[PDB]
Ligand binder design. Structure first.
Ligand SMILES: [Zn+2]
Ligand SMILES: [Zn+2]
Lengths: 254, 254
């Protein structure tokens, strides 16, 4: 109809066809702290997120309770300096979901990660689906904080169940047959051209700069492996890593 | 309270402090067409805007009628490839207001622009203030499409009343005393270091690439001049242009 305003009125009878959501990405993080401490942090004037899922969510009426700290219409400070598929400032176009989880701890030199309680994951799935459906977020745009900030974050980490969620319609995941095909008859750990892999990763969305050190290049490859090749994420380019990138780019494009 | 959902419930009792709007910029354009044609275009599957103000808005109850084609919560396709103050894809974080106006036409070689009907401007002011206040948009973030896409657009053009609107609390505008001060005792048209100006413009928000042709450099300077130095926008760097940039950066930063 016609909305009355101060000094003018708005005629909303005519709606444009080019009208889409400002929200396109869903970022998963881990708090690396206990619930109360995470809650206090994510609610202070420095960092925040849209959701905070506890390690073992308190059940009410057969449903787990997830905290919401920021309205989805507003942006939260959870991504920081970031870049993904050609966009920067991901806080602007994304929704951040913090999962209570210790993250990693160097125990005997071996930087070990903390597994995710199945309860937490089960509570996340429903949430992720509402968000994704509510803004038609594409599978490749459901990312790890590490994916949009490879040089600074690892979260949610190698122990986060990306495949499990994919089979639930959440997140991008290659196709077995396609991954093998692209392997081109090579051992999964067969060394590959680093640069050729980085090219595929940049095309998939990873922030690859045209002048990175071997350390930075490993970071990008590593973050990619913690997501889609958790069995080994040393940041070394090999057949399987490249075979997975090719299948992902083939199924999700760029 | 506690919101009930499918498979989980949301506890919104705890609100984070870091919660801000995703909308930060307001872009002004001209349709370069009549109302009906502009309306048909801005509502088709290719381009659109959040608002369409007619040359002479139809009054109803003493108030002009402005059309709204896209909800402010959604993004519209009005900015295209763009960049401003470090951000790209301005469609994501902005609101676009199309003003019915012919734009420019080369009459006798002299590319002439079409003045803006005072009625249209009077209807715009109220609108712009609600938007700005509704998301606390900063003055320097109320821009010309040309400002975020210097190499492609001129709109709203040199005839658009930016100073008039500024005095109304809409848009950034230097301070007389400060502009003179920075002139450092020089004729307003005194030639200045092109590169030194481009640096100030890049710091203010203009997309300056580290390898532009003289033509592209003139575009950036020109777009800047059509906005803040409409008396002359030849894309040539001179005392006044630089003196204005310095006063703007001094009063709005970056
Ligand atoms: Zn994170
Ligand atoms: Zn425009």
């Amino acid at each position: 109809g016609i909305v009355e305003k101060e000094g003018y009125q708005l005629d909303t009878r005519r709606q444009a066809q080019a009208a889409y959501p400002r929200i396109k990405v869903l970022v998963i993080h881990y708090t690396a702290d206990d619930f109360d401490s995470s809650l206090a942090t994510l609610t202070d004037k420095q960092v925040s997120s849209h959701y905070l899922v506890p390690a073992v969510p308190p059940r009410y009426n057969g449903k787990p309770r997830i905290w919401q700290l920021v309205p989805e219409q507003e942006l939260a400070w959870h991504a920081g300096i970031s870049a993904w598929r050609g966009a920067t400032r991901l806080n602007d176009t994304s929704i951040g979901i913090e999962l209570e989880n210790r993250g990693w701890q160097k125990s005997a030199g071996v930087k070990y990660f903390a597994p995710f309680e199945p309860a937490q994951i089960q509570a996340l799935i429903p949430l992720a689906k509402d968000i994704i459906a509510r803004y038609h977020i594409k599978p490749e745009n459901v990312v790890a904080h590490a994916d949009i900030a490879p040089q600074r974050k690892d979260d949610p980490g190698p122990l986060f169940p990306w495949q499990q969620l994919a089979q639930q319609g959440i997140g991008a995941w290659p196709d077995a047959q396609r991954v093998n095909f692209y392997l081109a008859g090579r051992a999964p750990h067969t060394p590959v051209d680093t640069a050729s892999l980085l090219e595929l990763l940049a095309r998939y969305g990873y922030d690859v700069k045209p002048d990175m050190t071997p350390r930075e290049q490993r970071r990008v490859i590593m973050a990619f492996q913690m997501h889609f090749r958790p069995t080994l994420y040393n940041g070394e380019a090999d057949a399987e890593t490249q075979a997975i990138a090719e299948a992902l780019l083939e199924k999700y494009g760029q």
